[PDB]
RNA sequence: UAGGCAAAGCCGCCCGGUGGAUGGCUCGGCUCGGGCGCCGAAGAAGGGCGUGGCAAGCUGCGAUAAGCCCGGGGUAGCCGCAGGCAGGCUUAGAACCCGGGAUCCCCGAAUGGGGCUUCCUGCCGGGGCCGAAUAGGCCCCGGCGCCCCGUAAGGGGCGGGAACGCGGGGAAAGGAAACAUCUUAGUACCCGCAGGAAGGGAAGCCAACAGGGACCCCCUGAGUAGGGGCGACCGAAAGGGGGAUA
RNA sequence: CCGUGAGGGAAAGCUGAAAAGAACCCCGGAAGGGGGGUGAAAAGAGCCUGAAACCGGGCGGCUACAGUGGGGCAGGCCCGAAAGGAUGCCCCCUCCCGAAGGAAACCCCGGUGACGGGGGAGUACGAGGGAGGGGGUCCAGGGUCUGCCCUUACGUCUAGAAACACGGGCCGGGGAGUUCACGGCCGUGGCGAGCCUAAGGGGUUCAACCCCGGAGGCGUAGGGAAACCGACAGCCCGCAGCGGG
RNA sequence: AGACCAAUCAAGCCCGGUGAUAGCUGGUUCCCCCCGAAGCGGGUCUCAGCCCGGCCUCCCCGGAGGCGGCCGGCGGGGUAG
RNA sequence: GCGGGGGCGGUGGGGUAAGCCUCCGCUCCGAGACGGGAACAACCGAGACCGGGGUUAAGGCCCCCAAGUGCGGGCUUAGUGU
RNA sequence: CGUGGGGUAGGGGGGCGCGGCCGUGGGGCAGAAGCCGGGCCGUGAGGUCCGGUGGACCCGCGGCCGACGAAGAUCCCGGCGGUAGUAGCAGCGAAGAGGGGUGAGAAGCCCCUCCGCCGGAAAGGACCAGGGUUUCCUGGCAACUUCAAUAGGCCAGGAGUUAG
RNA sequence: GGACGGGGAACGAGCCCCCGCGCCCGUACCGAGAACCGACGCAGGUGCUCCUGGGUGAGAAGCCCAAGGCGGCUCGGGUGAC
RNA sequence: CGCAGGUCGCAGUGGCAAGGGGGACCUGACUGUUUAACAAAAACAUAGGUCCCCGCGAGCCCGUAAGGGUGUGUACGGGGGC
RNA sequence: GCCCGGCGAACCCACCUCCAGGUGCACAGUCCUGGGACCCCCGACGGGGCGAGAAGUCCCUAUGGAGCUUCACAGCAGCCUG
RNA sequence: GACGGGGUUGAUGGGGGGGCGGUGUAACCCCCGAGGGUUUCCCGAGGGGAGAGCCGGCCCCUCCCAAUCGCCCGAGCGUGC
């Protein structure tokens, strides 16, 4: 089945003008989709939020450091009973190192890099403008319990969509922006 | 002081994901009316197993195994559900439909005898094979159930079928605002036995001095007479009108 | 498929007119993704439409010194194309009429006084209803937030429910006075000292419809257990109505 | 030990009678308009039910009187004190 | 519908008493909105079709809170009391 | 005209909606039903229109009939939440490590070395019932294994049980 | 298997050599802390049912080690508060 | 299996393995059995004691019946109580 | 256990609740009058939420059961007798 | 999570040397040893001497190794009373 994006190319350009002050055409937009990935759905949402507004190289470098357990990911929404940690950013103490989710996002970023390159876009000026994860279909399974009862033990898959735009180099951020209160 | 100005969180709309509602559809169901109505030792119904080039299920079929023969209809396509890959069949008339035949494994009333495994095994007669042998052994085919009728030759019963029919055995729950007689009910259910229908049927009748005229079924008589802790409740018959008529 | 067994037993329909069932290029270990195609439409084989709950993203409003939901009034921000008004709405000014109600300054009389009374004055004003002029730009409606005022979840039995009385996590779909017989009564319709046919029969354009069928049922008379017997227009009061004054 | 007789025993399980019965408990689905109660008396194996009256409602007949108040005339009464 | 309940009155009758039991009567709640009583079915006021204007009822008028730090006399020293 | 306007149970009177039928009048591929949002009308049940989506049926009016209206029944069936990236994946006296290979990818698959546990046995040898292909070979990783996987009692294809 | 009897033939063995025949069904694998039953790849139950070397020791006890098997009673790492 | 001598340790059945003991009362004699899943007991049973029905075509018990159990038995026996 | 990586449920859930003293179907998160609180997150606990679990087994009621008893009302076998 | 110290302009952890401490005297060598035998050059539990040996989640000294390379946050402007 085909999966649609929450945002069409026409509104992606409109969003780019609203956030960067520049006008671009749908020819400067690259997309990729990773349907039904077997990974944590809550941590996928946190990753998509964090890498939005990064350049593609910035997101790749950070995620490659999550895999090595050298940089964490902030957990803003799914934080009940999650411990605090020292963080490289400012304004939020709840952090995780989702290795499995990071590896899948790196494959999606690899597909997105190719899709932009195939269009002739300059990858150094590619900026992630929209990222979203969705709970996909469930793969049902049961866990036998005590007293003759069985309870659900499900694999909830994740649909990840990503859209990036090629911006003029004079408006592209050159460093990480890591004030999470202001972000 | 308020704005630029933002945490986590809240509300609303749009888009997406999830979900499968709604709407439309319908080769399915249900109800009613009409027809038609038995199958089985000539081995049934039911079941098991097998059967397709690639085939698991369903459907069909039975080692001749989605099929064989003859005839009629039907003419050019065909190889079931089932839209694939091959290879074939068919104008010397197929597929398909209808009638008649052939084949029809094992179990099954199952019937030579067993059967704790739908498989095993005996005797007799005939045949084949191994074998030097005519011995011995092995294999194939046929007969071999019980109870009966008949002098015998021979013949009969058995099992099945959605409901309906005939004979017998035969409750309780509930109701009676408790409950026992009673009712429920000669019901549920059980046992036996038939047919395409069964049962009934040809006055030791009914009536009332006037007369009907075998029987069954329908309408009525009638919730009347009558039965009944005369309570709950139960409940005709003759007569009259019809279906049909022997 | 469940139970040793007697027995018990689900869920599950829909591509398109036509496969035209997605060539080809790039990426991926692969599921697959991007580009590019087919078609009227992706309707993409996880296949019509594709709601809500639910989750993600975007947008609008709020957000860390202020206790929550609902209603009214006033305001902030945002939407306000169509289907509503724009002959609108708002402000100012002027004019007219005006219900119930209705002052004040000031003069006079009283009281220690709060205040009362006569005049001013049924005036100024007053719900609303009419007419005109100047100025402005959207108004209505909607989302959200703030201020002020008001405000004790629902369903239920109960004398008494916000109850520390019980039931519901949410959403969708489903989910409860029916039919026959008999009786009483009502509202109408047909016929009327009569009313209706039942089963059934003939025809049909064949369960409809037309015609036949009066058996029987109820009514026309009651009293009595039964044998048995078996019925009014005479007088008064008087509503309606009619006639007289 | 009223143990155990297939997770079942002061009387198994399966299917049937069977939609057993329940004066008891739960539920009973759209809108507006008119009027508007009762928990009293009597009887009942009656006391968580039901029937006959009181109280509600709707329709019809009938046809001129009626009475939660007061005054007076004529009566009754045996309480407070 | 045949479970009633609150206020007041019959020293009702009973009971140590009871937000107690059992009668008699008016009213109210049940089935009655609203103002006052701090909250509060039945205490006080009062009965609501909808919108608006006005005036009163109970009760209140230092602030919370609309309206008086209202007027004369007297008492209390306990924050009694309100 | 009314010193008319509260109301539970209950009685009485009128209307709205849903599915079909008998009539009548219409709409629809120049877009029906359904669906999302919105304006207008009605006290209200509800009606109607607009924009979007959709792709073939539907509606007004009169009459008639019902398998006819849900917020609730520890209601039924399905779906899906918060809980929550939480509990558990400890306890029953074994456990791993280094190097190499394979592979897209290796703590975990294969080989060696080191370390450990059983040894009258939750563990080695045999084997009944029961199971029925789980056996063996080749290949594989969507699902399955409380984690991983290139492994496997899993999946696909092939094969295998010999008696005086 | 033997003995004790009865009947029959003229041949003929339990010894030696030599010839022939022996049907039908089962046979893989697990046999259990993952192949059985318990909804499960379940610390239970079935089956430890039958068998087991050396040292110590009374011992088929425990402990240690062979033959033989296992690291699959199918999560890993860090920290060293309560 | 014993004797003599030497000698070390906190500890010599050094780990492993492996009884705490005594006095008295109540109670059931004892071993045994029991509420599978809250009771293991003083409850049940028991050997022993005693009573009853019975000479067998009996006594007691099962079956609608045909018939059956005790009984392939016989008072030193079968059945039934305490 | 806690922290990291991986898998990934359930109970329960009208909505969801700072404290005091009142009031009320007499034991209030939601009403009244006060007192406080910058918001969010982690660990822990078990005082409260008349916490969750289970249509109270206690007790009563029903013209409800079951089983058991006998000197209940009846009935049927079995045995004895004509 | 936080907190505190150091971060080359440095003794922050390790290594090395030294101090202090725990245990109890390793190896090698020499002597004694109940007794027995290849007769007294061998066996032999054990005792003595010299040397301790092993070890430190403590202290000092010494740059030998590592405190590196790097990644971020951050006010700046208006308006009214
Ligand atoms: Mg179990
Ligand atoms: Mg997952
Ligand atoms: Mg935020
Ligand atoms: Mg057959
Ligand atoms: Mg046979
Ligand atoms: Mg027959
Ligand atoms: Mg019945
Ligand atoms: Mg009865
Ligand atoms: Mg009874
Ligand atoms: Mg006949
Ligand atoms: Mg006949
Ligand atoms: Mg009868
Ligand atoms: Mg679709
Ligand atoms: Mg507009
Ligand atoms: Mg307009
Ligand atoms: Mg109650
Ligand atoms: Mg009560
Ligand atoms: Mg309530
Ligand atoms: Mg209740
Ligand atoms: Mg609940
Ligand atoms: Mg007992
Ligand atoms: Mg029984
Ligand atoms: Mg019974
Ligand atoms: Mg039953
Ligand atoms: Mg009224
Ligand atoms: Mg009740
Ligand atoms: Mg008088
Ligand atoms: Mg007196
Ligand atoms: Mg009463
Ligand atoms: Mg009273
Ligand atoms: Mg009531
Ligand atoms: Mg008040
Ligand atoms: Mg004031
Ligand atoms: Mg009214
Ligand atoms: Mg109509
Ligand atoms: Mg309701
Ligand atoms: Mg549910
Ligand atoms: Mg959940
Ligand atoms: Mg844990
Ligand atoms: Mg061990
Ligand atoms: Mg392990
Ligand atoms: Mg060992
Ligand atoms: Mg041992
Ligand atoms: Mg073994
Ligand atoms: Mg294998
Ligand atoms: Mg293999
Ligand atoms: Mg397999
Ligand atoms: Mg074998
Ligand atoms: Mg296991
Ligand atoms: Mg070995
Ligand atoms: Mg762990
Ligand atoms: Mg020990
Ligand atoms: Mg004893
Ligand atoms: Mg027990
Ligand atoms: Mg015990
Ligand atoms: Mg005893
Ligand atoms: Mg004695
Ligand atoms: Mg005695
Ligand atoms: Mg974790
Ligand atoms: Mg109180
Ligand atoms: Mg509460
Ligand atoms: Mg906690
Ligand atoms: Mg109860
Ligand atoms: Mg109960
Ligand atoms: Mg009673």
XYZ file of N, CA, C and O (backbone and C1' of nucleotides) in Angstrom, chain B residues 123-179:
399
model
P -6.793 -73.144 6.749
O -8.089 -73.950 6.301
C -8.741 -74.844 7.186
C -10.119 -75.198 6.689
C -10.201 -75.702 5.259
O -9.867 -77.071 5.139
C -11.860 -74.070 5.606
P -9.147 -77.615 3.815
O -10.292 -77.593 2.710
C -11.444 -78.411 2.832
C -12.505 -78.034 1.827
C -12.073 -78.002 0.371
O -12.049 -79.287 -0.221
C -13.316 -76.059 0.866
P -10.982 -79.634 -1.367
O -11.495 -78.826 -2.640
C -12.719 -79.169 -3.269
C -13.097 -78.189 -4.349
C -12.015 -77.826 -5.348
O -11.817 -78.812 -6.341
C -13.119 -75.869 -4.649
P -10.375 -78.984 -7.023
O -10.202 -77.672 -7.907
C -10.923 -77.521 -9.120
C -10.789 -76.132 -9.701
C -9.394 -75.681 -10.093
O -8.943 -76.221 -11.318
C -10.463 -73.952 -8.917
P -7.374 -76.477 -11.548
O -6.745 -75.018 -11.613
C -6.972 -74.189 -12.739
C -6.460 -72.791 -12.520
C -4.957 -72.634 -12.398
O -4.288 -72.659 -13.645
C -6.009 -71.395 -10.701
P -2.792 -73.232 -13.746
O -1.891 -72.099 -13.084
C -1.619 -70.894 -13.780
C -0.987 -69.853 -12.891
C 0.435 -70.119 -12.431
O 1.406 -69.823 -13.419
C -0.855 -69.382 -10.604
P 2.819 -70.581 -13.408
O 3.568 -70.001 -12.134
C 3.999 -68.653 -12.081
C 4.547 -68.327 -10.721
C 5.781 -69.108 -10.306
O 6.976 -68.545 -10.806
C 4.195 -69.126 -8.552
P 8.284 -69.452 -10.977
O 8.768 -69.722 -9.489
C 9.346 -68.688 -8.713
C 9.760 -69.188 -7.356
C 10.623 -70.433 -7.343
O 11.986 -70.157 -7.582
C 8.893 -70.655 -5.757
P 12.832 -71.075 -8.583
O 12.762 -72.527 -7.940
C 13.300 -72.789 -6.654
C 12.772 -74.082 -6.093
C 12.992 -75.321 -6.941
O 14.307 -75.833 -6.835
C 10.769 -75.292 -6.159
P 15.171 -76.144 -8.150
O 14.425 -77.384 -8.809
C 14.911 -78.009 -9.989
C 14.457 -79.445 -10.062
C 13.009 -79.692 -9.674
O 12.146 -79.546 -10.788
C 14.433 -81.242 -8.563
P 10.699 -78.876 -10.636
O 9.854 -79.951 -9.827
C 9.586 -81.238 -10.361
C 9.041 -82.157 -9.300
C 7.850 -81.612 -8.525
O 6.624 -81.954 -9.147
C 9.516 -82.389 -7.016
P 5.494 -80.853 -9.445
O 4.140 -81.688 -9.424
C 3.020 -81.261 -8.655
C 2.717 -82.217 -7.526
C 3.918 -82.585 -6.661
O 3.524 -82.824 -5.313
C 3.028 -84.538 -7.632
P 2.207 -82.182 -4.660
O 2.410 -82.559 -3.135
C 3.015 -83.797 -2.797
C 4.146 -83.624 -1.820
C 4.036 -82.450 -0.872
O 3.156 -82.708 0.202
C 6.249 -82.620 -1.701
P 1.995 -81.668 0.566
O 2.764 -80.484 1.290
C 3.618 -80.731 2.395
C 4.608 -79.612 2.568
C 4.029 -78.211 2.508
O 3.469 -77.802 3.740
C 5.924 -78.330 1.117
P 2.169 -76.865 3.777
O 2.714 -75.428 3.375
C 3.689 -74.773 4.170
C 4.396 -73.685 3.405
C 3.520 -72.578 2.851
O 3.190 -71.610 3.825
C 5.020 -73.294 1.183
P 1.774 -70.865 3.775
O 1.957 -69.735 2.675
C 3.022 -68.804 2.744
C 3.185 -68.073 1.440
C 1.914 -67.505 0.839
O 1.520 -66.286 1.424
C 3.107 -68.647 -0.826
P -0.034 -65.928 1.561
O -0.464 -65.448 0.110
C 0.151 -64.332 -0.507
C -0.141 -64.283 -1.985
C -1.606 -64.257 -2.377
O -2.188 -62.975 -2.253
C -0.476 -65.835 -3.704
P -3.768 -62.819 -2.022
O -4.404 -63.100 -3.448
C -4.118 -62.275 -4.564
C -4.777 -62.807 -5.810
C -6.271 -63.057 -5.709
O -7.035 -61.885 -5.913
C -5.228 -64.939 -6.671
P -8.432 -61.694 -5.155
O -9.422 -62.679 -5.912
C -9.727 -62.494 -7.285
C -10.531 -63.644 -7.833
C -11.774 -64.024 -7.047
O -12.881 -63.183 -7.313
C -10.557 -65.972 -7.587
P -13.947 -62.854 -6.157
O -14.763 -64.208 -5.981
C -15.717 -64.608 -6.949
C -16.229 -66.002 -6.697
C -16.942 -66.231 -5.378
O -18.285 -65.789 -5.406
C -15.427 -67.999 -5.784
P -19.016 -65.322 -4.057
O -19.299 -66.678 -3.277
C -20.189 -67.653 -3.796
C -20.191 -68.898 -2.949
C -20.455 -68.683 -1.470
O -21.834 -68.585 -1.174
C -18.586 -70.104 -1.745
P -22.335 -67.598 -0.016
O -21.825 -68.289 1.323
C -22.410 -69.492 1.789
C -21.587 -70.133 2.878
C -21.384 -69.324 4.148
O -22.494 -69.387 5.024
C -19.334 -70.300 3.479
P -23.498 -68.145 5.156
O -23.786 -68.035 6.716
C -22.766 -67.655 7.624
C -23.262 -66.643 8.625
C -24.611 -66.932 9.254
O -24.507 -67.827 10.343
C -24.506 -64.664 8.574
P -25.495 -69.079 10.468
O -26.707 -68.516 11.319
C -26.486 -67.878 12.565
C -27.616 -66.944 12.895
C -29.009 -67.523 12.748
O -29.398 -68.288 13.869
C -28.923 -65.400 11.727
P -30.269 -69.616 13.671
O -31.735 -69.068 13.416
C -32.338 -68.164 14.323
C -33.550 -67.513 13.719
C -34.503 -68.449 13.007
O -35.356 -69.118 13.913
C -34.126 -66.537 11.675
P -36.109 -70.462 13.489
O -37.271 -69.950 12.543
C -37.444 -70.496 11.254
C -38.222 -69.567 10.371
C -38.832 -70.226 9.153
O -40.046 -70.884 9.441
C -37.677 -68.301 8.475
P -40.357 -72.298 8.767
O -41.059 -71.909 7.404
C -42.145 -71.002 7.377
C -42.437 -70.580 5.968
C -42.536 -71.714 4.965
O -43.810 -72.321 4.953
C -41.117 -70.047 4.112
P -43.945 -73.907 4.810
O -43.295 -74.227 3.396
C -43.934 -73.837 2.192
C -43.104 -74.187 0.983
C -42.589 -75.612 0.904
O -43.569 -76.541 0.485
C -40.844 -74.126 0.373
P -43.671 -77.970 1.196
O -42.269 -78.656 0.886
C -41.829 -79.802 1.605
C -40.954 -80.688 0.752
C -39.740 -80.019 0.125
O -38.623 -80.008 0.992
C -40.912 -81.247 -1.522
P -37.742 -78.684 1.167
O -36.859 -78.610 -0.157
C -35.823 -79.546 -0.417
C -35.564 -79.665 -1.897
C -35.025 -78.414 -2.575
O -33.612 -78.323 -2.489
C -36.875 -79.245 -3.795
P -32.867 -76.905 -2.591
O -33.148 -76.404 -4.076
C -32.427 -76.922 -5.187
C -32.986 -76.408 -6.490
C -32.972 -74.897 -6.666
O -31.735 -74.400 -7.144
C -35.126 -75.710 -7.155
P -30.978 -73.213 -6.373
O -32.127 -72.183 -5.991
C -32.608 -71.229 -6.923
C -34.050 -70.889 -6.648
C -34.304 -69.656 -5.801
O -34.220 -68.446 -6.526
C -35.603 -71.431 -4.980
P -33.698 -67.117 -5.799
O -34.851 -66.755 -4.765
C -36.108 -66.278 -5.209
C -37.106 -66.211 -4.081
C -36.813 -65.212 -2.981
O -37.135 -63.881 -3.329
C -37.449 -67.259 -2.019
P -36.305 -62.665 -2.695
O -36.920 -62.494 -1.241
C -38.311 -62.307 -1.056
C -38.690 -62.408 0.394
C -37.957 -61.480 1.342
O -38.487 -60.172 1.333
C -38.060 -63.648 2.268
P -37.550 -58.921 1.663
O -37.435 -58.921 3.243
C -38.571 -58.747 4.072
C -38.183 -58.865 5.517
C -36.969 -58.048 5.917
O -37.314 -56.718 6.243
C -36.720 -60.260 6.695
P -36.315 -55.514 5.920
O -35.168 -55.677 6.997
C -35.464 -55.778 8.384
C -34.215 -56.042 9.176
C -33.119 -55.004 8.964
O -32.396 -54.824 10.174
C -32.317 -57.130 8.344
P -32.609 -53.501 11.042
O -31.741 -52.405 10.297
C -30.356 -52.266 10.548
C -29.698 -51.423 9.494
C -30.285 -50.044 9.269
O -29.933 -49.088 10.250
C -29.985 -51.072 7.198
P -30.920 -47.868 10.570
O -30.880 -46.988 9.252
C -29.694 -46.323 8.855
C -29.871 -45.633 7.530
C -30.837 -44.463 7.513
O -30.261 -43.268 7.995
C -31.277 -45.866 5.676
P -31.168 -42.167 8.721
O -32.105 -41.609 7.570
C -31.576 -40.887 6.472
C -32.683 -40.482 5.538
C -33.825 -39.721 6.181
O -33.539 -38.345 6.337
C -34.689 -41.438 4.809
P -33.042 -37.763 7.746
O -33.960 -36.488 7.965
C -33.433 -35.254 8.413
C -34.464 -34.175 8.252
C -35.842 -34.525 8.795
O -35.979 -34.197 10.162
C -36.041 -33.792 6.566
P -36.677 -35.212 11.188
O -38.233 -34.952 11.008
C -38.799 -33.685 11.295
C -40.012 -33.428 10.443
C -41.198 -34.344 10.681
O -41.985 -33.920 11.778
C -40.782 -34.165 8.364
P -42.838 -34.964 12.646
O -43.995 -35.432 11.663
C -45.008 -34.534 11.247
C -45.799 -35.100 10.100
C -46.518 -36.408 10.376
O -47.748 -36.221 11.046
C -45.387 -36.542 8.306
P -48.118 -37.099 12.333
O -48.488 -38.518 11.734
C -49.504 -38.657 10.760
C -49.687 -40.100 10.390
C -49.868 -41.049 11.557
O -51.198 -41.073 12.033
C -48.273 -41.930 10.058
P -51.520 -41.511 13.538
O -51.202 -43.065 13.578
C -52.044 -44.003 12.937
C -51.616 -45.414 13.240
C -51.414 -45.759 14.701
O -52.615 -45.989 15.405
C -49.594 -46.568 13.473
P -52.679 -45.725 16.981
O -51.824 -46.904 17.622
C -52.334 -48.223 17.682
C -51.350 -49.193 18.282
C -50.840 -48.884 19.676
O -51.766 -49.165 20.702
C -49.032 -49.517 18.328
P -51.824 -48.235 22.006
O -50.535 -48.634 22.847
C -50.395 -49.923 23.412
C -48.966 -50.219 23.787
C -48.381 -49.433 24.944
O -48.793 -49.898 26.209
C -46.832 -49.480 23.187
P -48.949 -48.871 27.421
O -47.461 -48.567 27.880
C -46.580 -49.590 28.311
C -45.210 -49.022 28.566
C -45.164 -47.838 29.512
O -45.174 -48.215 30.870
C -43.909 -47.339 27.591
P -45.830 -47.258 31.967
O -45.259 -45.812 31.636
C -43.992 -45.386 32.107
C -43.672 -43.979 31.669
C -44.650 -42.899 32.083
O -44.529 -42.498 33.430
C -44.134 -42.620 29.819
P -45.699 -41.641 34.101
O -45.451 -40.171 33.558
C -45.269 -39.083 34.439
C -43.813 -38.804 34.679
C -43.523 -37.465 35.323
O -43.654 -37.519 36.726
C -42.122 -37.753 33.447
P -44.592 -36.480 37.490
O -43.654 -35.218 37.695
C -42.395 -35.337 38.337
C -41.405 -34.344 37.788
C -41.775 -32.880 37.945
O -41.416 -32.385 39.219
C -41.079 -33.290 35.726
P -42.103 -31.083 39.852
O -41.587 -29.877 38.953
C -40.224 -29.486 38.987
C -39.873 -28.527 37.883
C -40.684 -27.252 37.823
O -40.254 -26.285 38.755
C -40.499 -28.167 35.659
P -41.283 -25.648 39.797
O -42.283 -24.806 38.895
C -41.812 -23.777 38.043
C -42.777 -23.485 36.924
C -44.193 -23.108 37.327
O -44.315 -21.748 37.699
C -44.278 -24.735 35.630
P -45.373 -21.276 38.807
O -46.787 -21.697 38.219
C -47.348 -21.054 37.089
C -48.765 -21.510 36.846
C -49.700 -21.475 38.041
O -50.197 -20.185 38.329
C -49.947 -23.527 36.935
P -50.266 -19.664 39.838
O -51.522 -20.421 40.452
C -52.788 -20.378 39.815
C -53.657 -21.550 40.199
C -54.011 -21.685 41.668
O -55.111 -20.868 42.019
C -53.378 -23.796 40.778
P -55.212 -20.201 43.468
O -54.283 -18.918 43.352
C -53.245 -18.663 44.279
C -51.906 -18.655 43.600
C -50.734 -19.053 44.497
O -49.880 -19.973 43.827
C -50.296 -16.976 43.446
P -49.807 -21.496 44.316
O -49.228 -21.410 45.793
C -47.847 -21.183 46.026
C -47.357 -21.883 47.268
C -47.346 -23.402 47.231
O -46.222 -23.932 46.560
C -48.324 -22.688 49.243
P -46.386 -24.988 45.366
O -47.079 -26.255 46.015
C -46.482 -26.985 47.072
C -47.435 -28.022 47.599
C -48.055 -28.923 46.545
O -47.243 -30.034 46.236
C -49.760 -28.025 47.897
